[PDB]
């Protein structure tokens, strides 16, 4: 279950396609707890594109839904990240992610 919810300003119609590399300035948050990531720290803003399974799968169909200069904020059911394995170290099992995404892409 991907639920957005937008910071309103963009255009809401240049929507990423399949196959587009895509630049992002996400940041990732734990429900009720500190940060684990961050693309605004390294400066290296992340370019990825739609539709190879690179990303896990709440934060890819959240990015479809989204426009240029948009600013959605994620909340990742466990089920489709990490809430069976949880990646060792840094996201414990059974997680619920949010993310302050901004799409900045080109393509």
Do not use: W
Not at 45 to 53: A, L, S
Request: aromatic share 8%; proline share 7%.
């Amino acid at each position: 279950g991907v639920e957005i919810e937008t910071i309103s300003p963009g255009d809401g119609r240049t929507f990423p396609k399949k196959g587009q590399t895509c630049v992002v300035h996400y940041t990732g948050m734990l429900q009720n707890g500190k940060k684990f990531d961050s693309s605004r720290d390294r400066n290296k803003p992340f370019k990825f594109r739609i539709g190879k399974q690179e990303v896990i799968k709440g934060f890819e169909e959240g990015a479809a839904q989204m426009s240029l200069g948009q600013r959605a904020k994620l909340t990742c059911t466990p089920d489709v990240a990490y809430g069976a394995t949880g990646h060792p170290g840094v996201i414990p099992p059974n997680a619920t992610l949010i993310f302050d995404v901004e799409l900045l892409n080109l393509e």
